Coordinates of C-alpha atoms in Angstrom, one line a residue:
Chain A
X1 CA -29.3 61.9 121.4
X2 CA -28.0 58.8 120.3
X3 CA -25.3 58.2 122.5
X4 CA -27.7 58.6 125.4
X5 CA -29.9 55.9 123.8
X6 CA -27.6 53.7 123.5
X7 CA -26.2 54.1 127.4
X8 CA -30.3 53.8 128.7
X9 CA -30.4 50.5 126.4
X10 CA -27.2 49.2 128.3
X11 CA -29.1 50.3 131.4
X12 CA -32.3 47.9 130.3
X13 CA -30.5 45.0 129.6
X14 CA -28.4 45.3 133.1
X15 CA -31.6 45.3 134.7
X16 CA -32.8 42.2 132.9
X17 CA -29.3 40.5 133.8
X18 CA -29.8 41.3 137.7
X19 CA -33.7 39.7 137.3
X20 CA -32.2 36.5 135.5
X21 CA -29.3 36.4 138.2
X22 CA -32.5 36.8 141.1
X23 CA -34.3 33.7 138.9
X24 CA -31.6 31.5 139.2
X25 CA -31.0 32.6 143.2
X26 CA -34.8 31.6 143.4
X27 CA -34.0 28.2 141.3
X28 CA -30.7 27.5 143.4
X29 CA -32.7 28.2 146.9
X30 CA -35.9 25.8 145.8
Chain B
X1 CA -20.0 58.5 115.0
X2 CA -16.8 55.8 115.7
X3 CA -17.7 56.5 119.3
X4 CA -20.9 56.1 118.4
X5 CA -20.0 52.6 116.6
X6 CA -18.1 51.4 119.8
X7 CA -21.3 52.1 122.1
X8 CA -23.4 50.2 119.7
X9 CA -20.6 46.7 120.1
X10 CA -20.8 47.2 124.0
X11 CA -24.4 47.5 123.9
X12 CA -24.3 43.9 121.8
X13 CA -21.5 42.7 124.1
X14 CA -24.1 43.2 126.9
X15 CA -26.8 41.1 125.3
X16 CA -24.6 37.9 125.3
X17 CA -23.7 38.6 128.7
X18 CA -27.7 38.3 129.1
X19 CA -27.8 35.4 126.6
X20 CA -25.1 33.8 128.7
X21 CA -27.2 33.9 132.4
X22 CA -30.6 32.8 130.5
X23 CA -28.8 29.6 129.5
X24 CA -26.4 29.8 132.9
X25 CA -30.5 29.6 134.6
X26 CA -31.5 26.8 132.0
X27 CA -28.8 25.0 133.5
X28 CA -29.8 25.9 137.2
X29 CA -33.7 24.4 136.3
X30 CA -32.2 21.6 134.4
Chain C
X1 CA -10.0 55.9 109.7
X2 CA -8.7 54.2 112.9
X3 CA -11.6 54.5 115.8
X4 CA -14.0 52.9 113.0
X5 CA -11.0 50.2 112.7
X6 CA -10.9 49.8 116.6
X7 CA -15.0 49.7 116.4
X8 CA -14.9 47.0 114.0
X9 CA -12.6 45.2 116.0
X10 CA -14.8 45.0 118.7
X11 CA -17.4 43.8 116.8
X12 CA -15.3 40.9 115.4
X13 CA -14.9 40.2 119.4
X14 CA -18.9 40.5 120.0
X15 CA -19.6 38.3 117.2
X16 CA -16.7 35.8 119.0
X17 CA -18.9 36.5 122.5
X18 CA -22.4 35.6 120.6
X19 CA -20.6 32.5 119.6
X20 CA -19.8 31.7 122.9
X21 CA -23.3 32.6 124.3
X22 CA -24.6 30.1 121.1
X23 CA -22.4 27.4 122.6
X24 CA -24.0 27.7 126.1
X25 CA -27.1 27.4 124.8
X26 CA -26.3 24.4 123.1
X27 CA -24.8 22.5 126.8
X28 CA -28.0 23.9 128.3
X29 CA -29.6 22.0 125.7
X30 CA -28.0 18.6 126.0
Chain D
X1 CA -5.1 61.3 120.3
X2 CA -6.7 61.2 123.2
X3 CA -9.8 59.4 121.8
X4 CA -8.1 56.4 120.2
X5 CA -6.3 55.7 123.6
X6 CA -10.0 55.5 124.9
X7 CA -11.0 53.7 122.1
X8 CA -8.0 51.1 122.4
X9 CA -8.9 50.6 126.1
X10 CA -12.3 49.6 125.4
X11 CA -10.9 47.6 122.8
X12 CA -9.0 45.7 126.2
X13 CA -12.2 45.7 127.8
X14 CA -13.9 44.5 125.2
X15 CA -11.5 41.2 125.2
X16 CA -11.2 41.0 129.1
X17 CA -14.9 40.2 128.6
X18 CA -14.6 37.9 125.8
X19 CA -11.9 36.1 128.3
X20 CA -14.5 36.0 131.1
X21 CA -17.3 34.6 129.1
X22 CA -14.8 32.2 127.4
X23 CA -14.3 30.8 131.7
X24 CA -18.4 30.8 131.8
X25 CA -18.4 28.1 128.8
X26 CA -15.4 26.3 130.1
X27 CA -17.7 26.1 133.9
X28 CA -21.2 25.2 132.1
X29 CA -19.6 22.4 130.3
X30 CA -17.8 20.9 133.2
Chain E
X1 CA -14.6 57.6 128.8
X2 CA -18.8 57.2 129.9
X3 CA -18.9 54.5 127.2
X4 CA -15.6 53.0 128.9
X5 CA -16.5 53.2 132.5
X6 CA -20.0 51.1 131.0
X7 CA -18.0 48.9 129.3
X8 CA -16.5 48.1 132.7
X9 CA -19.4 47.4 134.6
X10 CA -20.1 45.3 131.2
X11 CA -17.1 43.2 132.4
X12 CA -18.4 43.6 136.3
X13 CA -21.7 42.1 135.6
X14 CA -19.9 39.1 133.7
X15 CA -17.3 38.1 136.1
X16 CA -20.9 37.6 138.7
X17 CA -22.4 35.6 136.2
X18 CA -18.8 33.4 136.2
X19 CA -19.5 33.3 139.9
X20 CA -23.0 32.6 139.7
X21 CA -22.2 29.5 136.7
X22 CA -19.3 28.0 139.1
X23 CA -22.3 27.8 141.9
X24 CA -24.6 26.3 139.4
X25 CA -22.1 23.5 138.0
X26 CA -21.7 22.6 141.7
X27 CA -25.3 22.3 142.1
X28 CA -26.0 20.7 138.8
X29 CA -23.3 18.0 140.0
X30 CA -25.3 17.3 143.2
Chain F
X1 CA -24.5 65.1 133.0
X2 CA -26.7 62.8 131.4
X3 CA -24.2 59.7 130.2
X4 CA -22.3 59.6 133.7
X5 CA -25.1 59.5 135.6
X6 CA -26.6 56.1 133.5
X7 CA -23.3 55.0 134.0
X8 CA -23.2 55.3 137.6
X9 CA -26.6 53.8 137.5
X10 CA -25.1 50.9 135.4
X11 CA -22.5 50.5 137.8
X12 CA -24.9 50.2 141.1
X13 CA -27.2 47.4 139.2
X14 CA -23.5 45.8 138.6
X15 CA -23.2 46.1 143.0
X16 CA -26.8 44.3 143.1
X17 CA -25.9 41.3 140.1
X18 CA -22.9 40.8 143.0
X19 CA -25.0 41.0 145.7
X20 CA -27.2 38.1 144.6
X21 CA -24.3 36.0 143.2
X22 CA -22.7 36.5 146.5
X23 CA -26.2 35.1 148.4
X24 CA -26.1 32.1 145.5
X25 CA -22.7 30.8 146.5
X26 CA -23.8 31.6 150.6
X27 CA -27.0 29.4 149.8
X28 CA -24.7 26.6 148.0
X29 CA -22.4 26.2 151.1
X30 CA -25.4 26.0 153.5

């Protein structure tokens, strides 16, 4: 339901954090 | 449903941790 | 009753967290 | 109950955070 | 006590963005 | 069930943010 929505929502946004924190390892490295 | 409530202010809690690296990597590029 | 009150704490604290994000933003920015 | 103890540790979570991305402005800016 | 143990990988995920922000004020400062 | 495991899902993209923070700071000391 919408409990488990919200958690896979949490889930999506995590993953964009860890591809912004990769971004910025790319940035740092250039 | 108050659970419910709480989920829905960690969910937005998580999307100004996101907001926060995307302008930590606007930093990073300049 | 008092899990809604505890929820809309936390919201009170998101909002504070946006505000913080919004700030960022703005030292990216200059 | 049980629940509000939950909901009152999340509560303390919930600032921990606020505390942490409170430190994140504090390093952007310096 | 799910929505908890997310809202403390929440906090996780910020304290490495704090990390990540301390390395990119250093860099950002030459 | 369902909730736990996006947790613990939650919780090992939180191991992965670290793992890149802690190559950011090893790239900034080299």
């Amino acid at each position: 339901g919408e409990i488990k929505a919200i958690a896979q929502e949490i889930k999506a946004i995590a993953k964009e954090i860890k591809a912004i924190a990769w971004e910025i390892k790319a940035i740092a490295q250039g």
